[PDB]
């Protein structure tokens, strides 16, 4: 009977950054996905791998909710098989991804006049991320062929650039809160089911 705490996922007052995206494992509950698509609040809603109609009828073993924040223009990279600063160093979606990605604009809650620079994003890395690989390393990356002994210099930068979220910015540079639902189906009895299955 106990439903899945999706309210503890979208409505959360504090979201984490994308380089340190948060994950809340969802299991042993009842899915009510009708709440999701019966709403005009979500800007980008794209279900990958699942049916556009069997949403409330499916039954998966476990469900993973990956929630983070990126700006208006970096949501196109939250998709299977994409190339981008977020889709290479922050959040890598596999090509066989099976789940629904949810995104909406939050330019009034995560932004403020004068500046709200609490959110960060990984700008540099010597290798593209693997799927589901969370990277929170804090070592000074080296860009050029000149070694770096940690000094913040010409080609040695702190690998986390802050997000400048002000209300008077372009549409592409506004905070968009993203929730990625990953449907895990293993060789085991399901735990997250719908109401009409």
């Amino acid at each position, epitope marked *: 009977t106990n439903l899945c705490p999706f309210g503890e996922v979208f409505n959360a007052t504090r979201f984490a950054s994308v380089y340190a995206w948060n994950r809340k494992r969802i299991s042993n509950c009842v899915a009510d996905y009708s709440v999701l698509y019966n709403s005009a609040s979500f800007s980008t809603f794209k279900c990958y791998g699942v049916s556009p109609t069997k949403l409330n009828d499916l039954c998966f073993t476990n469900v993973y909710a990956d929630s983070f924040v990126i*700006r208006g*223009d970096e949501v*196109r990279q939250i998709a299977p098989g994409q*190339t*981008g*600063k977020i889709a*290479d160093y922050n959040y890598k979606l596999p090509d066989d991804f099976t789940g629904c990605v949810i995104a909406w604009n939050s330019n009034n809650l995560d932004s403020k006049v004068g*500046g709200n*620079y609490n959110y960060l*994003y990984r*700008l*540099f890395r010597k290798s593209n991320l693997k799927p589901f690989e969370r990277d929170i390393s804090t070592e000074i990356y080296q*860009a*050029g062929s000149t070694p770096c002994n940690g000094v*913040e210099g*010409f*080609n040695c*930068y*702190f690998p986390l*650039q*802050s*997000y*400048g*979220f*002000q209300p008077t*910015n*372009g*549409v*592409g*540079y506004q905070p968009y809160r993203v929730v990625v639902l990953s449907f895990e189906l293993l060789h085991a009895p399901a735990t997250v089911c719908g109401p009409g299955s």
Partner: antibody
Amino acid sequence: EVQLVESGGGVVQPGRSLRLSCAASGFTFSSYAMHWVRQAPGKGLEWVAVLSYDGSNKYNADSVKGRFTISRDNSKNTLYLQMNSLRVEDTAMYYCARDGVSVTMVRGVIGPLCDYWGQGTLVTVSS
Amino acid sequence: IQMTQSPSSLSASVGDRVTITCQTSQDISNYLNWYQQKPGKAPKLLIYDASNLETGVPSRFSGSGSGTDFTFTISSLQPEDIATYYCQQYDNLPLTFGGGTKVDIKR
């Protein structure tokens, strides 16, 4: 809306000094970085130097390191480019543009970079 | 320091589909920019970081950002569109531009 009006370029023999100006208007100037980029007559664009949001990060390009220094007055919403030891080659039209994507420069990534709004053809004429 | 390549000297009739490919040099560049420069006027930022054009452009331009090779697609060519098109990289601070592409509508 926003206009990066420039004035201060003229004709001056090689070896002298002449600074340029980049007067901002509209948007908050103490929040965005500022570039300087020139284009020779008939040639293409060529980067010169840049300034952070007054964070003491110049990072000038080559052939001008020590000859050009970038100055900004965020309380006056203006931007300067002091020029000394005129290489006669430096005759070009200089453009100043904003920036909001740089890494050790302007705090936070806001908007794109190099929204040009440039003018002020600066000729480094001979004797 | 890169030396960005670009095929210049284009020619296409009114209302066509052209493309310009800016392949980068060493240290593969991420998120180039696309500008247009009509004669006698300062350049203008057309597209954002390898995609996602700004507000004001007539939405006839596009691009794709994939590592070392980039493209710049122009659909539905216009008589008031003859200019010079550059591509600029920003991952190392010595920013370098392209070669510029002169456009002339076939009449």
